[PDB]
Amino acid sequence: HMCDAFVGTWKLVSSENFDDYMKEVGVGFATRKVAGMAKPNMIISVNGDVITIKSESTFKNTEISFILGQEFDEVTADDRKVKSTITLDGGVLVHVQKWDGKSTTIKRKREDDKLVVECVMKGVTSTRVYERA
Ligand X SMILES: O=C(O)[C@H]1C[C@@H]2ON=C(c3ccc(Cl)cc3)[C@@H]2C1
- Is residue 86 involved in binding ligand X (CB under 6 A)? no
**Residues in the chain, how many?**
133
Shortest separation between residue 73's beta carbon and ligand X, angstroms: 15
Is residue 106 part of the contact set for ligand X (CB under 6 A)?
yes
Question: What one-character DSSP code corresponds to residue 11?
Answer: E
Q: How far is the CB of 1 from ligand X (least distance, A)?
A: 23
Nearest CA to 108 among 53, 64, 58? 53
Nearer to ligand X (CB atom), residue 1 or residue 65: 65
**Phi and psi torsions of 23, nearest 5°:** -55, -45
Residue 43 and residue 10 in contact, taking contact as beta carbons nearer than 8 Å = yes
| Of positions 9, 17, 31, 127, contacts ligand X by CB under 6 A | 31
84 belongs to the binding site for ligand X (CB under 6 A):
no
Residue 4's CB is within 10 A of a number of other CB atoms, namely 9
Contact 32, 21 (CB under 8 A): no
Q: Is 128 annotated as a binding residue?
A: yes
Least distance (Å) between residue 113 CB and ligand X: 17
- Could you give the angle at the alpha carbon of 75 between the alpha carbons of 42 and 102, nearest 5°? 105
* 42-81 footprint of ligand X as x/- string (CB under 6 A): x------------x--------------------xxx---
Note whether 27 binds ligand X by CB under 6 A. Answer: yes
Cα distance between residue 21 and residue 36, in whole Å: 11
Binding site for ligand X (CB under 6 A): 22, 27, 31, 35, 42, 55, 76-78, 106, 117, 119, 128
